[PDB]
Amino acid sequence: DGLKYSLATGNWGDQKKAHQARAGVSQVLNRLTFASTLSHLRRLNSPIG
Amino acid sequence: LRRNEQNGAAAHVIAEDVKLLQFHVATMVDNELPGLPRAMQKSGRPLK
Amino acid sequence: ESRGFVENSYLAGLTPTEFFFHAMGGREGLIDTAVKTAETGYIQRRLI
Amino acid sequence: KNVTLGVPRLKELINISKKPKTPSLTVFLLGQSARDAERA
Amino acid sequence: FIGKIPIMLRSTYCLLNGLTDRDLCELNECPLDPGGYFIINGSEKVLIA
DNA sequence: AAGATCTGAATTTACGGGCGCAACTATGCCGGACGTAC
RNA sequence: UUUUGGCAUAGUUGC
DNA sequence: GTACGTCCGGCCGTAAATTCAGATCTT
Chain A positions touching E6 (Cβ under 8 A) are 3-4, 7
Q: Give strand pairing partners of E39.
A: E44
Q: How many helices (H) and strands (E) does chain E have?
A: 1, 2
* Residue E39 DSSP SS3: strand
CA C28 to chain centre: 4
Tell me how the structure was determined. Answer: cryo-EM
DSSP state of B1: -
CB E10 within 8 A of CB E39: no
Residues 1-40/A with CB within 7 Å of nucleic chain G are 10-11, 23-24, 27, 30
CB D7 within 8 A of CB C43: yes
Resolution in A: 2.7
Chain A positions touching E5 (Cβ under 8 A) are 3
Closest CA to E38 of A34, A27, A33: A27
Residue among A4, A29, A45 whose CB faces E6 most closely: A4
Q: Would you call A19 an interface residue with chain B, using a CB distance cutoff of 8 Å?
A: yes
**Dist CA B39 CA B30 (whole Å):** 10
**Dist CA D17 CA E46 (whole Å):** 47
What is the pairing mode between strands A11-12 and E43-47? unpaired
Nucleotides on chain H that have an atom closer than 7 A to a protein CB are: 10, 12-13
Nucleotides on chain F that have an atom closer than 7 A to a protein CB are: 14-16, 18-20, 25-29
